[PDB]
Amino acid sequence: KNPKSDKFKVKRFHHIEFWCGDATNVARRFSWGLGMRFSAKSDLSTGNMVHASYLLTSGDLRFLFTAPYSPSLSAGEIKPTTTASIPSFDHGSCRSFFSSHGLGVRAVAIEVEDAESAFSISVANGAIPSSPPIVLNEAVTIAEVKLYGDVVLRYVSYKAEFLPGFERVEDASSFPLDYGIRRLDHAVGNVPELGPALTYVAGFTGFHQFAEFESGLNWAVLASNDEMVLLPINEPVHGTKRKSQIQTYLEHNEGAGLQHLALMSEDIFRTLREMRKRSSIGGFDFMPSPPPTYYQNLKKRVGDVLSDDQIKECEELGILVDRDDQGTLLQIFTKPLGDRPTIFIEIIQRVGCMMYQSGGCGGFGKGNFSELFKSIEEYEK
Amino acid sequence: KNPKSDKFKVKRFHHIEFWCGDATNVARRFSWGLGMRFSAKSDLSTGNMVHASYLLTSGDLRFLFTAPYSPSLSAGEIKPTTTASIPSFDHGSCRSFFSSHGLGVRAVAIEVEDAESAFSISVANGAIPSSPPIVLNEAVTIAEVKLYGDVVLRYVSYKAEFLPGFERVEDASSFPLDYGIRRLDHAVGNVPELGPALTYVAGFTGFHQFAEFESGLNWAVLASNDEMVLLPINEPVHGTKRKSQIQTYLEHNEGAGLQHLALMSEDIFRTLREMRKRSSIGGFDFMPSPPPTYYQNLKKRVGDVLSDDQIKECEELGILVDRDDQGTLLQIFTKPLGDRPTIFIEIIQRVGCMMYQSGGCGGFGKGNFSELFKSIEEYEK
Ligand SMILES: C[Si](C)(C)CCOc1c(S(C)(=O)=O)ccc(C(=O)C2=C(O)CCCC2=O)c1Cl
Ligand SMILES: C[Si](C)(C)CCOc1c(S(C)(=O)=O)ccc(C(=O)C2=C(O)CCCC2=O)c1Cl
Ligand SMILES: [Co+2]
Ligand SMILES: [Co+2]
User: Fold this and answer.
1) Residue A60 CB: number of other CB atoms within 10 A?
2) Packing angle, helices B308-317 and B268-277, rounded to 10
3) Hey, is the C-beta of B52 within 8 angstroms of any chain A C-beta?
4) What backbone phi and psi angles, to 5 degrees, belong to B223?
5) Pocket of ligand 1, candidates A108, A218, A258, A333: which has the most ligand atoms within 8 Å of its Cβ, to mutate?
């Protein structure tokens, strides 16, 4: 059931902004590890005395990395005279965020028809305001409301190139890396209590619950009208034999925040070959692979969607597989992106639900919790 | 003249420690950009609830990257029960350092015969104490005194594998990168006033001034007895047409700190080929190359040390060349390592002064200030 109850018109995920201590080193690491091109900048070289922001792109996926300069560089500025390209930025907030949570996502940004309207309707419907709507160079409007923890949902709308005051980066400085990643599929938050978080977010967005099909968590997924903006939320379950990884997140993160970003690839096998080649030379590591029993058991569950070669090519790369009543999902998870066991990345590819592919085809891998358990015990014997 | 007036026995540069916001991303970036292997760790996986520290090595060069975890992870600890592997570490100091200066060097560490003695004699001779001598697992002694700004000179001595509580990293996780870098040649500080900084440091070390042979700086070099520990210090010169880059450093860094690290390569040409291949795929960028006139003028000044092929191979790579009355130096400079125009890296190779090669053979490139000026104007015509 899709009641299509969005309270304002939502388009697609627009970008994800990381708040960093040094944006240069995180951005260069991510570019190599994920195969994303440097495409725009806003920093001292573009007149920004407030923050350094570097934009990486791969297909429609946009990763923004932002860090504060010394406040002394802009101590004479006021908001009307600011040189910041992102008017919501605040030195204090950024330093406080990074010292509290370490490296992670500050903004989940979605493009909307009218960011001023989205903001007004959101806060009229219970959203906690974070940064009021601001029109940038009469062309782009940005607004922000609290999402969970210190993460904001950022609305961006365009009258008619990332943001004004960002410059396209020099072709010499911009190497065309590409490992097949194409867009953000979903963005997942961890919270102490799922109910109140769901009530808050669905309350001010009108996003509806996306239908699904002992592991220490409960979750639900909020979706926009066409189900292309997908926001799962996890809560821990206490008392289990193995401590809830959601609780471990909340402790190391100092509370609620973004748990993982799921990046759709147009060829997950090429992506995983390319990322795994770079794991030990500056890229990302991957979760330990499932046992061979998991891949032995894949014939019975998806033998009609994947060939024997494609299945064995999953086992080489550690890829996980799950299936809906509509489609099939291939997924794999990185180790944490930084020092703390908090944010990680998911690479996914969806098979089926062709009408274009409808959003969320195949689900989010719920069945793989039960299946991973079965396979580790089967394999032991 | 070398009066050999060290007040305690100094051996070699031991390591350089960067204070970071996220040590993982900086370390992985540096590993790829510089060709340094991951060789030791101290973090949550080794029982350290206080800080994440990752060690990169290339030859004798040791780069340590350290960031704080949430203080809540260790809130029940006291110094006698600490899980930190580096007892001088302090959450507050580290966060304050990084928020003030951004990414940069916290410790210049030299190995000495007796770190307790080095500390006592240092502070008896005017050194400002920073962290008292501590014996780690009855095997290694660490002590720290203020050097300049928020940079400490760290003494390490071994009774008889980096530090106790660090683990050798998994061979699978430890890819054997190597672009030819072999050891730290010198480490350079920028200060507002050269005189008082020199008086302080030479006062408590007994290091002597190393003999040398309109650009906005004055400098001098302090050296240990065998001149293998080399600590140049710069001060700005005000009033010049072009603003002193030393003054620009002090402003963006919020005061005194480490300006550059000079890394000796056993084959600067291989190093520069390897680093330049990676500049736009996650590595380091290099200063703009000098004009062809600089390389035309190299025949007259070093045509008896470098072949025509070797000279043209310098021009391909942007390498700079200078000469002492004893030896010849090849050098090149990276762009700043992080967001701020502060710390950068120098790659160097020294030719001559064979006895082993005596320290500082060829100098530090003083002649290249005058020569670069001459060459840009010559080239214009
Ligand atoms: C952190 Si973990 C030590 C890697 C153990 C969890 O990992 C998985 C696994 S699975 C079989 O690996 O356990 C499967 C799916 C997902 C996943 O994406 C996801 C959603 O997007 C929304 C619903 C909640 C959820 O879980 C995740 Cl996080
Ligand atoms: C920051 Si800059 C925009 C790259 C301009 C400076 O660069 C250079 C140049 S040179 C010809 O490039 O001007 C040559 C040598 C060195 C150098 O290493 C050095 C020492 O170790 C100790 C003495 C002081 C000193 O300067 C440097 Cl920093
Ligand atoms: Co997911
Ligand atoms: Co130098």
Assistant:
1) 14
2) 30
3) yes
4) -140, 150
5) A333
Tokens 């977010």 sit on residue: A201
Q: How far is B184 from chain A (nearest CA, A)?
A: 22
Using CB atoms, pick whichever of B38, B44, B282 lies closest to residue A28.
B282
Of chain A, the end-to-end C-alpha distance in Å amounts to 42
H/E run at residue B238: none
Q: Is B352 left (phi over 0), alpha (psi -120 to 50) or beta?
A: left
DSSP secondary structure code for residue B224 in this structure: -
Q: Whose CA is nearest to atom 2 of ligand 1?
A: A245
According to DSSP H, which parts of B185-302 are helical?
194-205, 245-252, 268-277, 292-296, 298-302
From CA A142, how far away is CA B130, in angstroms rounded?
A: 46
Report how far residue B331's alpha carbon sits from residue B364's, in angstroms, rounded to the nearest whole number.
9
Q: How far apart are CA B294 and CA B311, in angstroms?
A: 11
Q: Note whether B240 and B325 are within 8 A (CB).
A: no
CA distance B361 to B326: 6
Question: Does the CB of B45 have a partner CB in chain A at under 8 Å?
Answer: no
User: In this structure, are residues A13 and A57 in contact, taking their beta carbons and an 8 Å threshold?
Assistant: no
Rounded Cα–Cα distance for residues B15 and B64 (Å): 7
Show the domains of chain A with their CATH numbers.
10-168 (3.10.180.10), 181-380 (3.10.180.10)
Per the entry, the structure determination technique was X-ray
Buried b (16+ CB within 10 A) or exposed e, B99-123: bebbbbbbbbbbbbebbbbbbbbbb
Candidates A12, A128, A102, A130; CA nearest to A62 is A12
Whether residue A162 contacts residue A142, with contact meaning beta carbons closer than 8 Å, is answered with no
Interface size, chain A vs chain B, as Cβ–Cβ contacts under 8 Å: 124
Residue B245 CB less than 6 A away from ligand 2? yes
Please check whether residue B98 touches A, CB under 8 A. Answer: yes
CA-A249 nearest atom, ligand 1? 1
* Distance from C-alpha of B183 to C-alpha of B259, rounded to nearest angstrom: 18
B87: buried, middle or exposed (CB in 10 Å: 19+, 13-18, 0-12)?
middle
Are the beta carbons of A340 and B100 separated by less than 8 Å?
Answer: no
Q: How far is CA B344 from CA B259, B315, B316, B338, in A?
A: 7, 21, 21, 8
User: Which atom, in ligand 1's list, is nearest to the CA of A232?
Assistant: 22
Residues with CB under 5 A from ligand 4 (ion): B 262, 346, 364
Among the partner residues B99, B173, B282, nearest to A32 by beta-carbon distance:
B282
**Backbone phi, then psi, for A117, in 5-degree steps?**
-65, -45
Rg (CA), chain A: 21
CB A328 within 8 A of CB A322: yes
